[PDB]
Amino acid sequence: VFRLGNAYLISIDEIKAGQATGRPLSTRKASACQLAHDQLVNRLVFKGSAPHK
Amino acid sequence: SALRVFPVTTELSPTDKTFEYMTFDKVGTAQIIADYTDDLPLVDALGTSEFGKVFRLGNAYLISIDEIKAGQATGRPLSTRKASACQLAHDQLVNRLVFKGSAPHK
Amino acid sequence: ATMGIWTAQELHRIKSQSYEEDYPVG
Amino acid sequence: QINASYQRDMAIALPGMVADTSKYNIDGACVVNEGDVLVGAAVQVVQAQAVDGHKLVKALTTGTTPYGVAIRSHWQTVNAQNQMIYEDGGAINVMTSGRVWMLSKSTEAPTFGSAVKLDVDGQEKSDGTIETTWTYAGGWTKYKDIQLVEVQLHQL
Amino acid sequence: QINASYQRDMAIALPGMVADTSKYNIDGACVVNEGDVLVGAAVQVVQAQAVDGHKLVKALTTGTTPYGVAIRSHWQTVNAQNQMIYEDGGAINVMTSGRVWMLSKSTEAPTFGSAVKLDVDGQEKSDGTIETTWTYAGGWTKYKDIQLVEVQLHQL
Amino acid sequence: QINASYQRDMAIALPGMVADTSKYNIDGACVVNEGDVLVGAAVQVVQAQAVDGHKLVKALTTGTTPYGVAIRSHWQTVNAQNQMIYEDGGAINVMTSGRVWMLSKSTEAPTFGSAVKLDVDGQEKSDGTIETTWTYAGGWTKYKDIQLVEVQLHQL
Amino acid sequence: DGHKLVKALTTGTTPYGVAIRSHWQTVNAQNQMIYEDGGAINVMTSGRVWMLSKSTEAPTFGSAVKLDVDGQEKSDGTIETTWTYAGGWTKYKDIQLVEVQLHQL
Numbered sequence: 001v002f003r004l005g006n007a008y009l010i011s012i013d014e015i016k017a018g019q020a021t022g023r024p025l026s027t028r029k030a031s032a033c034q035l036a037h038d039q040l041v042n043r044l045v046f047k048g049s050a051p052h053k
Numbered sequence: 054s055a056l057r058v059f060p061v062t063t064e065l066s067p068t069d070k071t072f073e074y075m076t077f078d079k080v081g082t083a084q085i086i087a088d089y090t091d092d093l094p095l096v097d098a099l100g101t102s103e104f105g106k107v108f109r110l111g112n113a114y115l116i117s118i119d120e121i122k123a124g125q126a127t128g129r130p131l132s133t134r135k136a137s138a139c140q141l142a143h144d145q146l147v148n149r150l151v152f153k154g155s156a157p158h159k
Numbered sequence: 160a161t162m163g164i165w166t167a168q169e170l171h172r173i174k175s176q177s178y179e180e181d182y183p184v185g
Numbered sequence: 186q187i188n189a190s191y192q193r194d195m196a197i198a199l200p201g202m203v204a205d206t207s208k209y210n211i212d213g214a215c216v217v218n219e220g221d222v223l224v225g226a227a228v229q230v231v232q233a234q235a236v237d238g239h240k241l242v243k244a245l246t247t248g249t250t251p252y253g254v255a256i257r258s259h260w261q262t263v264n265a266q267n268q269m270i271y272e273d274g275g276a277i278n279v280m281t282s283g284r285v286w287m288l289s290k291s292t293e294a295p296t297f298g299s300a301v302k303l304d305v306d307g308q309e310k311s312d313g314t315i316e317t318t319w320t321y322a323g324g325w326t327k328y329k330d331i332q333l334v335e336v337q338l339h340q341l
Numbered sequence: 342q343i344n345a346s347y348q349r350d351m352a353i354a355l356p357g358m359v360a361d362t363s364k365y366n367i368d369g370a371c372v373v374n375e376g377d378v379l380v381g382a383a384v385q386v387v388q389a390q391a392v393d394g395h396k397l398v399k400a401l402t403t404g405t406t407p408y409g410v411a412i413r414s415h416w417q418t419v420n421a422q423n424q425m426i427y428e429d430g431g432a433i434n435v436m437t438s439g440r441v442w443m444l445s446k447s448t449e450a451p452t453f454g455s456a457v458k459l460d461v462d463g464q465e466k467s468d469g470t471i472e473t474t475w476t477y478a479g480g481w482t483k484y485k486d487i488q489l490v491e492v493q494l495h496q497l
Numbered sequence: 498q499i500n501a502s503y504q505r506d507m508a509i510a511l512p513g514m515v516a517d518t519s520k521y522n523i524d525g526a527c528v529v530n531e532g533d534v535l536v537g538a539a540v541q542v543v544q545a546q547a548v549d550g551h552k553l554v555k556a557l558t559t560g561t562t563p564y565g566v567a568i569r570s571h572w573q574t575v576n577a578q579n580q581m582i583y584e585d586g587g588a589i590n591v592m593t594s595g596r597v598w599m600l601s602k603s604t605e606a607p608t609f610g611s612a613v614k615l616d617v618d619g620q621e622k623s624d625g626t627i628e629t630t631w632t633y634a635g636g637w638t639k640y641k642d643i644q645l646v647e648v649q650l651h652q653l
Numbered sequence: 654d655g656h657k658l659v660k661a662l663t664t665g666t667t668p669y670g671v672a673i674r675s676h677w678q679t680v681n682a683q684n685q686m687i688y689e690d691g692g693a694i695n696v697m698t699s700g701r702v703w704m705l706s707k708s709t710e711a712p713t714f715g716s717a718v719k720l721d722v723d724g725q726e727k728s729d730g731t732i733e734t735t736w737t738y739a740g741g742w743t744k745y746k747d748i749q750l751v752e753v754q755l756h757q758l
Contacts, residue, residue, distance in 0.1 A: 003693075006083045007093035007362050013416040025098070025415060032081040032096035032351070035182060039350060040083040042185030051658055052085065053691035065172055072172040078180045080352045084655050087678050087693040092361040092440075094655065097413065099355075101423075109276075157216045157234075157241055159274035160267045161199055161331075163259045185348045364699075366520045389609045389635025392509060396635065406610065438520070454667070454758060476758060479657065495757070496520075496651075497610060497632065545714040545740025552740065562715070652756070653715060653737065 002052070004040055006033055055151040065107065072105045108158070110146055112139055196328045198286045200225030201257045201269070204324060204335050209283025212253060215240045217277050224262065224269040225288040225333075227251040227307035228279060242277060245307035251317055252341065253279040254287060282340045284322045289332040294325045301336055309334050353482040354442040356381030357413045357425075360478065360491050365439025368409065369432065371396045378427045380418065381444045381489075382463035383407040384435060398433060401463035407473055408497060409435040410443055438496045440478050445490040450481040457492055465490055509638045510598045510645055512537035513569035513581070516636060521595030522652060524552070524565065525588065531555045534583045536574060537600045538619035539563040540591060554589065557619035563629055564653060565591035566599060594652040596634050601646040607633040613648055621646050659694060662724040668734055669758060670696035671704060699757045701739050706751040712738040718753055726751050 008029040018024035065072060081096030114135040124130035201224035203209065218241040222228055229249040231241040245251055255271060256278050262269040271277045290304055291311035298320055302313040324335025357380035359365065374397040378384060384398045385405045401407055411427060412434050418425045427433045446466035454476050458469035480491025513536035515521065530553050534540060541561045544553040557563055567583060568590045574581040583589045602616055603623035610632055614625030636647025662668055672688055673695045679686045688694045707721060708728040715737055719730035741752030 002085055003087075004083050005086045005090070005093055006081070006096065008096050009359065009362075011414070011416065014414075017416055028077075028079060028098045029096050032079045032098065033083075035079075035184065036081040036083040036096065036351065038184045039182075042348070046185070049085075051656060051691065064174070068170065069172045070170040071167075072174055074174040074176065074178070076178045076180075079182075080355055082351070082353055082655065085693060087695050088675055089673065089695045092363045094361050095359055097355050097358055106275075155237070157218055157239060157274065161269060161328075162264045162267070163262060163269060165259065167263070182349050182351055183347050185346075364520075368519070386609060391606060391635065391637040394636070480655075493758070497649075542714060547711060547740065547742040550741065652754075 004037055006036060008033060055148045059151070070107060073102055076101050076103075110143055112142055114139060196326075198324070198326050198328060198333045198335075199257065200286060200288050200328075200331065200333060201255055202286045203256060203280070204284035204286055204322065207284055210281050210340065211256070212240075212279045212281050213276065214238065215242050215277050215279050217242060217271050217273050217275055219243045219273070221265075221273060222255055222271045222277070223288070223307075224255050224257055224271070225286065227254055227287075227303055228277075242279065245303065245305070245315070247305050247314075249315075251303060251307065251315070253281045254285050254336070254338065256280045256285065280338060282338050285336055285338060286324070286333050287336045289334040291332070291334070295321045295334065297321060297323050309336065352484055354480070354489050354491075355413060355484065356442065356444050356487060356489060357411055358442045359412060359436070360440035360442055360480065363440055366437050366496065367412070368396075368435045368437050370394060371398050371433050371435050373427050373429055373431055373433050374399045375429065376400055377421070377429060378411050378433065379444070379463075380411050380413055380425050380427070381442070383410055383443075383459055384433075384463070398435065401459070401461070401471070403461045403470075405471075406497075407459060407463070407471070409437045410441050410492070410494065412436050412441065436494060438494050440491060440493055442480065442489050443492055445488040447488070447490070451477045451490065453477055453479040465492065508640050510636070511569065511640060512598060512600055512643060512645060513567060514598045515568060515592070516596035516598055516634065516647055519596060522593050523568070524591045524593055526550060527552045527554050527589050527591050529554060529583055529585055529587060529589050532585060533577075534567050534589065535600070535619070536567050536569050536581045536583065537598065538567060539599075539615055540565055540567060540589075540619065554591065557615065557617075557627070559617045559626075561627070563615060563619070563627070565593045566597050566648070566650060568592050568597065592650055594650050597648050597650060598636070598645050599648045601644045603644075603646075606637045607635075607646065609633055609635045621648070659696060662720065662722075662732075664722045664731070666732075668720060668724075668732070670698045671702050671753070671755065673697045673702065697755060699755045702753055702755060703741070703750050704753045706749045708749070708751070711742045712751065714738060714740050726753065 010026055010029065014025050078099035079096065082094050084094055086093065116132055116135065120131050124132065216239050218231060220243055222244050227245045228242045229245050230252045231243060233240045242252065257269060258278050261276060261278055263272050287309050289309045291309060293311065301309060301317050301319040301321060303315045303317060304310040304313045305315065318339065320337045322335040322337040326333050372395055374387060376399050378400050383401045385401050386396055386398055386408050388397045413425065414434050417432060417434060419428050444464045446460060446464055457465060457473050457475040457477060458467065459471040459473060460466040460469045461471065474495055476493050478491040478493040482489055528551050532555060534556055539557045540554045540563065541557050542552055542554055542564045554564065569581060570590055573588060573590060575584050599621050601621040603621065605623060613621060613629050613631040613633060615627040615629060616622040616625050630651055632649045634647040634649045638645050659669065674686065675695055678693060678695060680689050704726055706726040708726060710728060718734045718736040718738060719727060720732040720734055721727040721730045735756055737754045739752035739754045743750050
């Protein structure tokens with residue numbers, strides 16, 4: 001079994017601007033993180049990793 | 054046949070000069086980590102936009118009083134034929150713009 | 160400064176429809 | 186305790202403004218090609234389409250015959266460089282005959298009826314290189330550090 | 342007919358993007374001086390105010406010492422020439438320590454841990470003239486048409 | 498009668514004060530021997546205990562290598578000669594990396610990014626005899642005839 | 654992909670970090686705690702760490718660290734390093750340890 005992880009950054013000004021304009025920036029970053037996790041799982045299943053055997 | 058094979062929309066206002074639309078994107082990645090880790094990778098997002106313009110078309114025609122009287126008397130007016138020709142010219146110009154473009158006007 | 164009385168934003172249209180990229184998972 | 190009343194006069198001209206309502210003719214079936222032109226400056230004709238019917242114009246350069254002067258319009262023009270310009274790939278309002286206000290680079294008032302000489306960028310100059318068949322219409326004024334001269338235009 | 346499903350992969354990085362969450366440091370009390378800075382390029386310090394505390398930075402030129410790299414910010418930047426830049430007379434986020442993705446002009450992948458050579462315009466390039474104390478962090482990707490490289494920044 | 502309003506500006510810094518909250522490191526497991534240490538002067542290490550884990554520090558002398566700068570705290574210091582100091586045989590706070598306000602003996606403003614040279618008593622001097630790997634950060638001020646300079650400290 | 658391939662240090666090579674303890678990622682072998690092939694490893698790049706030693710005399714504070722071909726500290730080693738000693742010098746049941754200050758590459 002294995003483990004995967006990543007992260008993202010944001011600032012207070014960006015949060016306030018996203019709330020005011022109507023297009024938040026944190027939701028897109030969360031979606032990108034989840035998509036990256038899913039795509040890495042797919043790659044491991046179909047392409048494999050040599051260093052990790 | 055250019056208004057019958059391509060969709061026609063009626064969103065633009067009669068007093069506009071330019072329209073614009075947006076597009077969005079994103080990036081990111083993931084990795085295999087250990088229990089004590091301090092270098093998790095990050096993600097981001099993008100955006101972009103495009104533009105479009107509007108143009109005006111026109112022509113005209115002439116007619117004299119003698120021709121008007123001759124049309125009224127002989128039963129075949131000459132003004133309605135010219136009006137039909139003007140309308141046909143406008144429609145054909147629109148079709149030609151759609152199917153051939155115009156290099157100077159981009 | 161010899162501009163006109165109308166600015167660009169007053170004669171400009173913003174289409175109310177956005178396009179997104181597609182990334183299928185697998 | 187005495188009241189004071191004051192009085193102020195308006196300016197009389199702007200660049201590219203039609204001087205008066207005498208006999209004039211506007212050639213509005215042209216399109217700007219290869220760059221942008223200034224309102225109040227001369228332009229030249231590159232080529233005329235045989236079938237489509239649109240002329241191609243741009244800013245005047247060395248050794249080229251002028252054709253007309255761009256005129257003001259609150260709808261057809263775009264605002265750039267703190268002034269009115271005509272952008273590339275768009276219809277332009279060119280004046281071929283009549284009295285117009287033109288940008289000047291000279292320093293002394295001209296003589297009524299004398300021939301107009303332009304600079305290499307399509308602006309009037311007392312000792313310019315490009316010679317035209319146009320004549321001065323008599324006006325000579327200034328709008329807030331911008332020199333303006335009145336020019337009479339006749340058809341080519 | 343038989344159904345089909347497809348697969349696509351996102352891009353890895355962007356110019357001027359923080360590579361990971363390692364020990365970094367951001368200097369946000371700086372102001373752009375006499376010009377604009379491209380996100381993802383190196384900067385230099387021209388003057389540090391003795392008492393006010395701000396630092397004046399500008400785009401890197403010949404015969405100077407780099408200080409940091411501008412980073413992406415959705416709020417504190419302006420979209421100009423289809424890129425994202427920091428304009429004149431405004432606050433700038435300058436990264437002085439950590440891993441960052443920045444623009445490159447090289448054609449072959451670099452060696453991990455070797456010294457970084459920058460071009461006169463502030464973008465990384467092999468066999469360049471300007472020498473720094475930064476090392477390559479082992480990253481060689483590319484956006485649609487932009488080359489990128491991962492660099493490790495040590496504080497001066 | 499005409500009313501009046503007045504204005505006064507605060508001072509900027511005090512000796513030994515931490516300049517910025519930008520990636521500092523403090524070693525609190527240090528003890529003082531052989532005299533006193535002025536808050537705002539360099540210190541040296543004379544012995545590192547192998548098993549207990551404490552480091553023995555004292556004021557900088559000739560022909561030595563500085564290790565850090567004593568910082569200012571309202572609890573661990575004592576008030577002597579009308580100023581804050583660390584007495585012999587007590588725990589001390591030593592900054593090993595960061596930005597600090599340090600006592601100076603020079604008269605000319607320093608150059609940003611250049612090396613720092615110390616005196617034989619632990620105070621910064623433009624023309625000193627002890628070389629360090631520290632650099633100037635651009636701060637240069639004075640609190641009531643006490644000159645202060647801003648120093649960037651890197652971990653040894 | 655982003656991953657880095659590490660192994661035990663050998664002759665004529667520059668060190669990168671030191672493996673650190675973990676009760677979950679490691680395995681028990683040879684009456685020691687080790688990291689096995691084909692698995693994630695915790696590598697410390699900067700800080701203070703206790704390290705195995707093959708020397709017999711206490712080091713000088715602030716001096717440069719010299720390693721061996723095997724990857725263990727040695728007073729007279731053929732591998733040059735930019736690390737420095739941190740002062741600690743202890744022993745755990747006939748196993749000699751030393752404190753090392755790691756600076757980022």
